Every structure is written in structure tokens, then in C-alpha cells.
Design a protein around this ligand. Structure first.
Ligand code: HEM
Length: 153
């Protein structure tokens, strides 16, 4: 469980992300695809993109980034009380997109990395820690669902 103090650290930096959601989302997905190119194979929509330049130039990829961070922000603001928002996400990701839990770990790291790059002042080690805990909580709850449906592994 995160403390109120840990949640305030998470939401404080998240408020800055919202000042440029598209930029953050585009950096996050690109970091993911480069660092773990198997994740890009899961997107029919983006697998024709080969270079970083190409990825940066894609408006559609930018759009999807926004969809991703908008959905995550709605979850984080619930400070753990996210059942209604996390359940349909788990379902689509398990049964339709077929995204293994390991990939959620990879994107979580991409998120931390980018937040470190863009907000060094408001993202010190305590904030980093807090954010890692919130993302673990997200995964843990997604995994429980996957298991119910028979997709944990
Ligand atoms: C931060 C974690 C993630 C969030 C919050 C998130 C959110 C979303 C949202 C809201 C959608 C559209 C609605 C839906 O189908 O549920 C979407 C679709 C999708 N997601 Fe996730 N996602 C996450 C992680 C991932 C990861 C790691 C991958 C794996 C490569 C992935 C692959 C997909 C795919 C393939 C679609 C459909 C894309 C399309 O063709 O339009 N997602 N995601």
C-alpha cells in the first residue's frame, strides 16, 4: 500500500506530465520500442516504423501515446481505488491484444526513465520510488485479472 505521502509525490510529478501529454507519450513508446523491439511487433498499427526518426514523425503514434497516458493518469488519481478503470484494460490486454505482464514491466521502466529525463527536479529518488510502487500496484492488479482469465503464464 502507498502512503498518502507517496501518492502526493506520484501525483505531483504527474501533474507536470499533463502539461505535455503528447510529448511524454511519444517519448515513452519510442523508448519502449527501441529498448524492447518485441513490443513493437504487437502493434499492427506501428510495426512498419523502423527508425527513431520515423517513429518521431508519426502523428498516429503520438495519438496512441496520449491514449495510454490519459488512461494511466485516470488510474493513478484513484490512488489505488481503480477497479472500474483497470478491469476493462486487463480484459482487452489479456484476451484481445495478448500483452504479457512482462511487457507492462517494460513500459513502466520506460515511463520512469522519461520522467527522469524531463523532470529531474521534481523526480528525485523518493519520487522515483513512489512511482515504481504505484506502477507495481498497477501490474499486480492487472496480473490478478489475467490469472482469473487464464493468461498469467
Ligand atoms: C501503461 C500501460 C498501458 C496502458 C495504460 C494502455 C492503454 C491502452 C488503451 C487505453 C488502449 C485502447 C483501449 C483498449 O483496447 O483497452 C490500448 C490498446 C492497445 N494496447 Fe495498451 N496500454 C498499456 C500497455 C500496453 C503495452 C505494454 C502494449 C504492448 C505492446 C500494449 C498494446 C496494446 C495494443 C496492441 C492496443 C491496440 C492498439 C491499436 O491497434 O489501436 N499496451 N492500450
Amino acid at each position: 500500500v502507498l502512503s498518502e505521502g507517496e501518492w502526493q509525490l506520484v501525483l505531483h510529478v504527474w501533474a507536470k506530465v499533463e502539461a505535455d501529454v503528447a510529448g511524454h507519450g511519444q517519448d515513452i513508446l519510442i523508448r519502449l520500442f527501441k529498448s524492447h523491439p518485441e513490443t513493437l511487433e504487437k502493434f499492427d498499427r506501428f510495426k512498419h516504423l523502423k527508425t527513431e526518426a520515423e517513429m518521431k514523425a508519426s502523428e498516429d503514434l503520438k495519438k496512441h501515446g496520449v491514449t495510454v497516458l490519459t488512461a494511466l493518469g485516470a488510474i493513478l488519481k484513484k490512488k489505488g481505488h481503480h477497479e472500474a478503470e483497470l478491469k476493462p484494460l486487463a480484459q482487452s490486454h489479456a484476451t484481445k491484444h495478448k500483452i504479457p505482464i512482462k511487457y507492462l514491466e517494460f513500459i513502466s521502466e520506460a515511463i520512469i526513465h522519461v520522467l527522469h529525463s524531463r523532470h529531474p527536479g521534481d523526480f528525485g529518488a523518493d519520487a522515483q520510488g513512489a512511482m515504481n510502487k504505484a506502477l507495481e500496484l498497477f501490474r499486480k492488479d492487472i496480473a490478478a485479472k489475467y490469472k482469473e482469465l487464464g493468461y498469467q503464464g
